[PDB]
């Protein structure tokens, strides 16, 4: 490394090199920090975590018990050891607490003043962070498996919601219009994700093994259906063009938004070109999931090489996105792992699990 410092200092390399390379080096060194803890507040498993996109200071966390906890990730104490204390919490006594498991929780991109959370009580509630009161409640006729607000839309403020119904609901937070539906799936929608590149592209994955990308502006159905083989097994599309051979319970666009990673219960992950949904044939090997609900996984950002961190049973498996090489499997949870979220500032990973723990993985040295 001192070579890296000397290269930065002399302008041999752009300073971008040392960031990105050092960021990567940090990611490869992720290790369970016992020099950092997250305060236990969930009585039930953590289904979801979300670090705020601006300033990355606060994390939301949704539990199987229905509570939403709001954690502060900055070490405000002077010690080197700290516990990420829980700022607020939608507890059992809140009048608005969810009744059943919170399945997704998301900071409003663009501003930390409002977050949204959806549950198995069939509601997507929008919250004022400051007063911690709901500002809006959308009711759905079927249990919500995931939602997602666009990380990029300065223009629209749609929330895509996937329920057990076969239809994707778009909920407009600007005047509250929960009527719009995308129709074309056939079984529950286990994962939705807006594109980080394009304002109005949404990808939705369903238990029917199909993943569709939609231009929600468009009035004409899906843009693309991802097909495992790219056409080697080609049929008039009524049942073919499955992304997976099981349920597809996870989606994640890569950072720059040029590829889509889907995980499904055939124990595979695939990487897809998000422009024409073609399959890049990245291998990745066998990725165990048997989650019956959405599997929340992330990608890294701002490294030399992009990584994807996928819950693999009771561990987080780290893979290199574009080559498939499994970097490592981070082993520190006790029960299955439900969600991992990446802190892009410091290359830290937080992962929740059914054992009611949120473990921080920070680079060593």
């Amino acid at each position: 490394m001192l070579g890296f410092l000397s290269a930065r200092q002399t302008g041999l390399e752009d300073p971008l090199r040392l960031r990105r390379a050092e960021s990567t080096r940090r990611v490869l060194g992720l290790e369970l920090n016992k020099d950092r803890d997250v305060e236990r507040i969930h009585g039930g498993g953590i289904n979801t975590l979300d670090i705020e996109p601006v300033e990355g200071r606060y994390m939301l966390s949704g539990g199987s018990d229905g509570v939403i906890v709001l954690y502060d990730l900055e070490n405000s104490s002077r010690q080197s050891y700290y516990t990420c204390k829980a700022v607020c919490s939608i507890g059992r006594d809140h009048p608005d607490v969810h009744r059943y498991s919170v399945e997704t929780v998301q900071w409003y991109p663009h501003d930390t003043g409002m977050f949204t959370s959806s549950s198995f009580d069939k509601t997507l509630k929008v919250w004022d962070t400051n007063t911690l009161q709901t500002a809006d409640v959308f009711n759905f006729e079927e249990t919500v498996y995931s939602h997602h607000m666009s990380p990029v839309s300065t223009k629209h403020c749609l929330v895509a919601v996937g329920t057990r119904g076969p239809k994707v609901q778009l909920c407009d937070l600007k005047s509250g219009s929960c009527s719009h539906i995308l129709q074309g799936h056939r079984q529950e929608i286990l994962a939705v994700s807006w594109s980080p590149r394009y304002d109005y592209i949404l990808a939705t994955a369903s238990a029917d093994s199909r993943v569709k990308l939609w231009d929600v502006r468009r009035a004409s159905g899906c843009l693309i259906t991802l097909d495992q083989h790219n056409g080697k097994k080609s049929q008039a599309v009524e049942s073919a063009n499955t992304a997976h051979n099981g349920k597809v319970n996870g989606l994640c666009f890569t950072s720059d938004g040029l590829h889509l990673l889907t995980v499904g219960t055939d124990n595979r992950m695939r990487l897809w070109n998000s422009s024409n949904g073609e399959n890049t044939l990245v291998n990745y090997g066998k990725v165990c999931n048997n989650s019956k609900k959405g599997l929340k996984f992330t990608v890294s950002c701002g490294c030399s090489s992009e990584f994807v961190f996928v819950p693999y049973g009771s561990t987080i498996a780290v893979y290199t996105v574009y080559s498939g090489e499994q970097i490592t499997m981070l082993k520190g949870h006790y029960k299955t792992v439900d969600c991992c979220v990446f802190q892009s500032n410091f290359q830290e990973l937080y992962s929740g699990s059914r054992d009611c723990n949120i473990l921080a993985w920070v680079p060593s040295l």
Binding site: K34, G332, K335, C356
Partner: protein, 141 residues
């Protein structure tokens, strides 16, 4: 070697009782060399994976005494101990299917009491003991 000799002399179920002289000899031997204990775990996995429940109890007690006394099993059970976390999650909880649980209920109670002791005995930064105890208390104690 001598580790295996002591393991055979202690884990033998014909006299299934805690003998203090042999345990102190094992403590002193483990303190004399750390490499005694790294293979001792391999011996203990032999006794945990053995058919007889009394041998499993004996190997569990030996692991606990080496972790709490020798100061070399502490660096196995409170550092580089994901194997220990997984053995705690597999012993008291159900063995992963198809393979079912083979230990005795008295061994389950002994493991519960050992976990409750180790929650305070060595928990300066190893809180997954308490987390596993809570998971047992809320799922398959």
């Amino acid at each position: 070697q001598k580790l295996s000799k002591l393991v055979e002399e202690l884990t033998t179920s014909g006299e299934p009782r805690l003998n203090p002289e042999k345990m102190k000899e094992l403590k002193k031997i483990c303190k004399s060399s750390e490499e005694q204990l790294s293979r001792a775990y391999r011996l203990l996995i032999a006794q945990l994976t053995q058919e007889h429940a009394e041998i499993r109890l004996s190997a569990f007690q030996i692991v606990e005494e080496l972790f709490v006394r020798s100061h070399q099993f502490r660096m196995l059970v409170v550092s580089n101990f994901q194997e220990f976390l997984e053995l705690t999650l597999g012993t008291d909880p159900a063995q992963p299917l198809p393979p079912p649980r083979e230990a005795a209920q008295r061994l389950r109670q002994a493991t519960t009491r050992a976990v409750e002791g180790w929650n305070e005995k060595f928990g300066e930064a190893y809180k997954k003991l308490a987390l596993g105890y809570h998971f047992l208390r809320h799922n398959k104690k």
